[PDB]
Design a protein around this ligand. Structure first.
Ligand SMILES: Cc1cc2nc3c(=O)[nH]c(=O)nc-3n(C[C@H](O)[C@H](O)[C@H](O)COP(=O)(O)OP(=O)(O)OC[C@H]3O[C@@H](n4cnc5c(N)ncnc54)[C@H](O)[C@@H]3O)c2cc1C
Ligand SMILES: Cc1nc2c(=O)[nH]c(=O)nc-2n(C[C@H](O)[C@H](O)[C@H](O)CO)c1C
Ligand code: SF4
Length: 508
């Protein structure tokens, strides 16, 4: 009869939060904490800090309007203990509470710490039902599978959600339409201007506090253009479904110098804090095709990314955690190059990627994977350091989705649990889907020499090094034949050029 103390973390700003459903507005109280422990666990991008904290403060006001009692502890409060557990104990000392209600979070280290907390009252933990697949449904699907592939999971979510289904058959007759016919942009096709949200009063105040207090964190805060409440986020989604969704897919993998956004949705930073809903989004995209405003392939490719990939990596993470976070399949022990933070690189494709990380805290999926991620796995950088960089510089970065994408797909450290194969590539690829190799100090058609493309030699060293391991996958074959046809002076050439580059790039 005392009431419930309900917690709401920074990435759970949703009205339908399982922790808030069934609240007694007359007895219960909601807790929201701006924690410097969570803000410093990594040194997140300045923009990621502004986004979360500005969204939280507005979300609280939304609850106060509806009649919710909300205890909001700011990062200014001189009594804020700085942690979730500390402020949980401080709330229970203020008044009486029957129990505590919360929703499982997206960080294993945190969700584990919280389950162990010794509290004077019981603590009920509920599942995060905003996701289309529950942690116990993925493990059921997985049982007995030699390898976990995404396409088969995807077909199972299409049949469960009913998206893009006409009867029991997939719209199209085919489940998937992704093809190999990718390419770069023409000389004359300029990408269209994208909609950026000007900071509202509250966002402006958070931006000022972050510029002053967190000056050491990575990235620039000027030009912040992310949405912070459902209204702003909805405008961003309307802009994508109307202007960009048709051509989505046509350019899903291309790359353009000084144009990081291209035809992407830019919704991950809002979706991951809950300002949007995954199901609602996929139904808008289907309605777009159903009604004739966008082709089917564009809609199926986009929807596949949300009910397929996004739900898949989460299903892996919780299934294999906490051992997943300690796996180093290739035994990489090299430091990260300094230009991953400073951007000072005559490699024009990596620099544009850090510039977009610095100025926009964003980079689309192909860049994170085939440039910086491909590189990180070629040089052989320790996976812990790679995870750090990806959790810092990007505004959509949370462990449950970052780690299976990086430790798994990009660098193969997990050993193929996520990706099935290493996405290793030479400079020929980047030249194929981008326009960097035009104005770069390096030659994309040279393998060795201080004017040659590092990706060429570094790629051939990654094959020779792990040749006897790649033979097992069966899909990394072809590069192994070319790994032959090599006069031992040729093979030996890139190996010392790889060592030279390594030492040069500062990775021992
Ligand atoms: C090395 C690496 C690290 C990544 N780290 C993150 C991360 O920390 N957070 C994150 O949300 N995504 C991450 N991704 C996935 C992908 O890069 C981003 O989701 C995407 O770039 C965000 O841009 P967008 O919103 O315009 O996506 P779009 O291209 O518009 O795609 C639509 C939606 O699909 C989802 N999606 C697409 N690809 C993936 C994927 N591989 N995994 C999960 N969801 C996906 C996102 O919710 C995205 O908003 C990573 C990918 C790689 C290769
Ligand atoms: C930067 C940040 N700040 C806060 C905060 O001030 N308060 C909070 O409750 N959560 C914050 N978070 C989110 C968590 O640290 C964590 O990354 C997610 O909740 C994962 O579920 C983040 C990521
Ligand atoms: S030549 Fe190599 S380093 Fe230069 S842009 Fe092309 S792939 Fe990148």
């Amino acid at each position: 009869m005392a009431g419930a103390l309900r917690l709401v973390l920074g990435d759970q700003l949703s009205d339908n939060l399982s922790a808030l459903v069934d609240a007694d507005l007359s007895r219960d109280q909601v807790l929201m904490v701006e924690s410097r422990v969570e803000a410093t666990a990594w040194k997140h991008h300045k923009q990621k800090l502004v986004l979360v904290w500005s969204a939280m403060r507005q979300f609280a006001e939304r609850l106060r309007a509806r009649g919710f009692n909300v205890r909001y502890v700011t990062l200014e409060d001189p009594d804020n203990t700085g942690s979730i557990g500390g402020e949980l104990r401080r709330a229970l000392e203020a008044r009486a509470f029957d129990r505590v209600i919360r929703t499982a979070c997206g960080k294993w280290g945190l969700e584990s710490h919280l389950l162990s907390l010794d509290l004077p009252v019981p603590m009920e933990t509920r599942e995060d039902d905003r996701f289309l697949c529950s942690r116990a449904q993925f493990a059921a699907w997985a049982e007995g599978r030699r390898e976990l592939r995404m396409e088969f999971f995807y077909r199972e979510m299409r049949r469960k959600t009913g998206l893009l289904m006409d009867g029991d058959q997939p719209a199209g007759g085919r489940w998937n339409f992704d093809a190999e016919n990718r390419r770069k942009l023409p000389p004359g096709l300029r990408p269209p201007e994208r909609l950026r949200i000007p900071p509202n009063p509250t966002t402006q105040t958070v931006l000022e506090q972050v510029s002053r207090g967190f000056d050491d964190h990575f990235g620039e805060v000027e030009g912040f253009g992310w949405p912070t409440n459902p209204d702003e986020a909805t405008a961003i989604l309307d802009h994508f479904i109307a202007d960009m969704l048709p051509s989505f897919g046509d350019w899903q993998d291309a790359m353009s110098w000084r144009r990081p956004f291209l035809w992407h949705s830019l919704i991950s930073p809002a979706l991951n804090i809950g300002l949007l809903d995954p199901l609602d989004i996929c139904r808008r995209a289907e309605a777009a095709w159903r009604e004739g405003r966008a082709p089917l392939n564009a809609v199926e490719g986009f929807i596949r990314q949300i009910i397929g990939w996004r739900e898949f990596v989460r299903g892996i993470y919780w299934l294999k955690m906490p051992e997943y976070a300690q796996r180093n399949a290739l035994d990489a022990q090299g430091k990260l190059p300094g230009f991953y933070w400073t951007g000072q690189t005559d490699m024009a494709c990596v620099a544009d990627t850090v510039r977009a990380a610095h100025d926009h805290a964003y980079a689309h999926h192909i860049q994170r994977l085939m440039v910086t991620g491909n590189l990180a796995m070629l040089l052989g950088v320790h996976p812990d350091a790679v995870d750090d960089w990806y959790m810092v510089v990007f505004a959509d970065a949370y462990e449950w989705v970052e780690m299976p994408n990086t430790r798994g797909m990009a660098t193969f450290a997990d050993g193929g649990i996520v990706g099935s194969k290493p996405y290793a590539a030479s400079g020929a690829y980047i030249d194929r889907m981008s326009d960097y190799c035009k104005g770069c100090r390096y030659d994309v058609k040279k393998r060795l020499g201080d004017d040659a493309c590092p990706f060429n030699a570094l790629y051939w060293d990654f094959i020779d090094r792990h040749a006897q391991r790649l033979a097992g996958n069966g899909r990394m074959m072809m590069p192994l034949r070319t790994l032959e046809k090599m006069p031992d002076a040729e093979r030996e050439a890139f190996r010392k050029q790889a060592r030279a580059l390594r030492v040069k790039m500062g990775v021992s």
